[PDB]
């Protein structure tokens, strides 16, 4: 399949080179996989989700995404137009309030929730969780992310937007999950992207167009935008049977475009998520 005039990030994950415009992907498109978007919620009614999104848990008064961030991330995972894995099932877990903030205890609880809830869902091709969030280092947040991964969920987390080593942020610094840096359309590390030895992979994160609340769309930037590209890619690859939740991060790294990025500090991987699609 080919989506013409796709958002640059989708084009980039299906090309060995920057600057293309078509997103090439196998039509299976993540069908049969599930992605939990642990964030400010998902506006599931957005037409771009085609009924494939639903809220499954909120830690606040409402499950509505009153912010937009979670809806944006969800759209990069799995919306029709903006999504990597266009046929995946999306499940929203609202751990962040409508200002985009959440206490660590709530974020942990939301991770534990996913680890259990997945057992109640039909996800024959496997389960991914996308965590476009983080704060300062917390062993308890890291341990929650590790548990979620151990439970059989492909966990992708944002590296953070501090232009610093991700070792000082969580859950970015948890080794066992897939920690995602951000790049821009010119294959530079995004100016805000964290870096460091704990990064596993980069994905497109600067000026990413996706869904927004009120049935709208907008372009925003962050490691939060790179993370759902990787989460979506994992779902896509899992549907194709090329990898499993436990191994998807390493598979993505092994099959990534290598050395294409600039302003990568020594010691940080130079790997950009790539679907290796061949018609
Ligand atoms: Ca290249
Ligand atoms: Ca890792």
């Amino acid at each position: 399949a080919a989506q013409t005039n796709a958002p640059w990030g989708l084009a980039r994950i299906s090309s060995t080179s920057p600057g293309t415009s078509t997103y090439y992907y196998d039509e299976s498109a993540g069908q049969g996989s599930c992605v939990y978007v642990i964030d400010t919620g998902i506006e599931a009614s957005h037409p771009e989700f085609e009924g494939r999104a639903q809220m499954v848990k909120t830690y606040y008064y409402s499950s509505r995404d009153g912010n937009g961030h979670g809806t944006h991330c969800a759209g990069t995972v799995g919306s029709r137009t903006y999504g990597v894995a266009k046929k995946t099932q999306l499940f929203g877990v609202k751990v962040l309030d409508d200002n985009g903030s959440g206490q660590y205890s709530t974020i942990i609880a939301g991770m534990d929730f996913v680890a259990s809830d997945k057992n109640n869902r039909n996800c024959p091709k496997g389960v991914v969780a996308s965590l476009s969030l983080g704060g300062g280092y917390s062993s308890s947040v890291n341990s929650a992310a590790a548990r979620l991964q151990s439970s059989g969920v492909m966990v992708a987390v944002a590296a953070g937007n501090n232009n610093a080593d991700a070792r000082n942020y969580s859950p970015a610094s948890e080794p066992s999950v897939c920690t995602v840096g951000a790049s821009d359309r010119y294959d530079r590390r995004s100016s805000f992207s964290n870096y460091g030895s704990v990064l596993d992979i980069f994905g497109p994160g600067t000026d990413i167009l996706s869904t927004w609340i009120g049935g709208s769309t907008r372009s925003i930037s962050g490691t939060s935008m790179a993370t759902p590209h990787v989460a979506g890619l994992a779902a896509y690859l899992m549907t194709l049977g090329k990898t499993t939740a436990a191994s998807a991060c390493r598979y993505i790294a092994d099959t990534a475009n290598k050395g294409d990025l600039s302003n990568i500090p020594f010691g940080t991987v130079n790997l950009l998520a790539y679907n290796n699609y061949q018609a």
Side-chain angles (χ1 to χ4, degrees):
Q3 174 184 356
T4 52
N5 297 310
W8 78 261
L10 300 191
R12 184 74 193 84
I13 67 165
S14 62
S15 181
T16 58
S17 65
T20 68
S21 58
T22 293
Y23 174 37
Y24 296 102
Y25 62 96
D26 191 275
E27 66 187 282
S28 52
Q31 170 77 243
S33 68
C34 300
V35 186
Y36 289 82
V37 180
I38 303 175
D39 209 291
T40 68
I42 304 172
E43 185 175 277
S45 63
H46 199 303
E48 280 281 329
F49 294 125
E50 308 173 302
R52 291 178 291 101
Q54 68 183 286
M55 282 306 295
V56 299
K57 177 69 180 186
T58 179
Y59 292 89
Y60 300 87
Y61 310 99
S62 176
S63 63
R64 171 174 166 269
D65 177 14
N67 183 273
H69 185 266
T71 296
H72 194 280
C73 295
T76 294
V77 176
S79 63
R80 184 201 77 157
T81 311
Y82 313 103
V84 175
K86 294 178 191 299
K87 292 179 185 172
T88 195
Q89 237 253 248
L90 298 163
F91 297 132
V93 180
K94 180 176 173 57
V95 301
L96 305 176
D97 69 21
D98 290 336
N99 293 321
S101 309
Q103 321 159 225
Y104 272 174
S105 56
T106 300
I107 289 162
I108 290 166
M111 305 184 232
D112 291 327
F113 172 85
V114 171
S116 179
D117 183 71
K118 82 179 179 302
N119 304 137
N120 314 325
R121 313 286 172 187
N122 254 340
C123 302
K125 300 304 184 183
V127 183
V128 181
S130 189
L131 288 65
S132 291
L133 52 72
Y137 177 87
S138 162
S139 64
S140 62
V141 170
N142 282 6
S143 175
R147 287 193 301 274
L148 180 58
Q149 176 74 42
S150 164
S151 81
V153 174
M154 202 267 191
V155 179
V157 314
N161 302 332
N162 317 95
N163 185 31
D165 197 307
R167 66 189 311 161
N168 285 329
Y169 299 93
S170 286
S173 58
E174 169 46 39
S176 68
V177 301
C178 202
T179 296
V180 184
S183 65
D184 69 31
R185 69 169 70 237
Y186 297 105
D187 278 0
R188 297 180 287 227
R189 173 170 67 86
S190 297
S191 58
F192 51 77
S193 181
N194 284 348
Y195 47 84
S197 67
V198 77
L199 268 67
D200 297 283
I201 188 72
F202 285 79
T206 295
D207 294 329
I208 310 293
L209 179 61
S210 186
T211 43
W212 197 255
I213 55 163
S216 65
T217 62
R218 67 175 64 180
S219 174
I220 55 168
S221 300
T223 57
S224 283
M225 279 67 258
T227 301
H229 281 90
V230 169
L233 178 60
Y236 168 92
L237 296 167
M238 279 148 80
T239 285
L240 286 169
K242 288 180 187 283
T243 193
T244 66
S247 64
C249 189
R250 215 87 280 106
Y251 181 88
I252 289 170
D254 286 348
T255 57
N257 283 309
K258 309 166 128 173
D260 274 353
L261 300 176
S262 65
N263 203 27
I264 300 290
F266 202 85
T268 297
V269 293
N270 191 328
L271 299 167
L272 183 61
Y274 175 45
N275 72 3
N276 294 88
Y277 176 79
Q278 315 302 144

